Design an enzyme around this catalytic site. Structure first.
Site, short mmCIF file in Angstrom:
data_model
loop_
_atom_site.label_atom_id
_atom_site.label_comp_id
_atom_site.label_asym_id
_atom_site.label_seq_id
_atom_site.Cartn_x
_atom_site.Cartn_y
_atom_site.Cartn_z
N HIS A 79 -9.92 3.83 2.76
CA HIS A 79 -9.18 2.93 3.67
C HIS A 79 -9.60 1.50 3.51
CE1 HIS A 79 -6.72 1.84 7.09
NE2 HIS A 79 -6.35 3.09 7.23
N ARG A 129 -2.70 11.40 7.64
CA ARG A 129 -2.49 10.74 6.35
C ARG A 129 -3.76 10.62 5.51
NH1 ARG A 129 -0.85 5.46 7.29
NH2 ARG A 129 -0.46 4.70 5.17
N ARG A 149 -5.68 5.67 -0.80
CA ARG A 149 -4.57 4.70 -1.00
C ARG A 149 -4.50 4.18 -2.42
NH1 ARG A 149 -4.17 6.66 3.36
NH2 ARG A 149 -3.98 5.49 5.32
N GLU A 199 0.79 -1.21 0.00
CA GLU A 199 0.00 0.00 0.00
C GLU A 199 0.84 1.28 0.00
OE1 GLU A 199 -0.95 0.71 4.54
OE2 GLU A 199 -0.41 2.24 3.02
#
EC number: 3.1.4.8
Length: 94
Positions: free
Chosen positions: A83, A64, A68, A53
């Site tokens: 997520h 953050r 992703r 990832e």
């Protein structure tokens, strides 16, 4: 199944992450490149260490954030904005 998305249609920051992966970094976060174990079986089931990832920067946040890219062992690319709850296959031809 999983939907398809064209690389050109992703947010700019996701495209930036794909470019950095292709360059092998350097990456902005210490957790960039950590194994993703695919524990909910949302992606195709593979052996251990198959997926990794990478963070897609979110300005919107201070942390953050949740966005992703997940790569596979033969260069497969997946987008997740949330997520790992949702994945789309990224079509690099596109």
């Amino acid at each position: 199944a999983l939907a398809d998305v064209c690389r050109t249609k992703l947010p700019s920051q996701a495209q930036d992450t794909l470019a950095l992966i292709a360059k092998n970094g350097p990456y902005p976060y210490n957790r960039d490149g950590v194994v993703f174990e695919n524990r909910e079986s949302r992606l195709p089931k593979k052996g251990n260490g198959y997926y990794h990832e990478f963070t897609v920067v979110t300005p919107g946040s201070n942390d953050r954030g949740t966005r992703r890219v997940v790569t596979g062992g033969y260069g497969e690319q997946y987008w997740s904005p949330d997520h790992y709850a949702t994945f789309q296959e990224i079509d690099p031809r596109c």
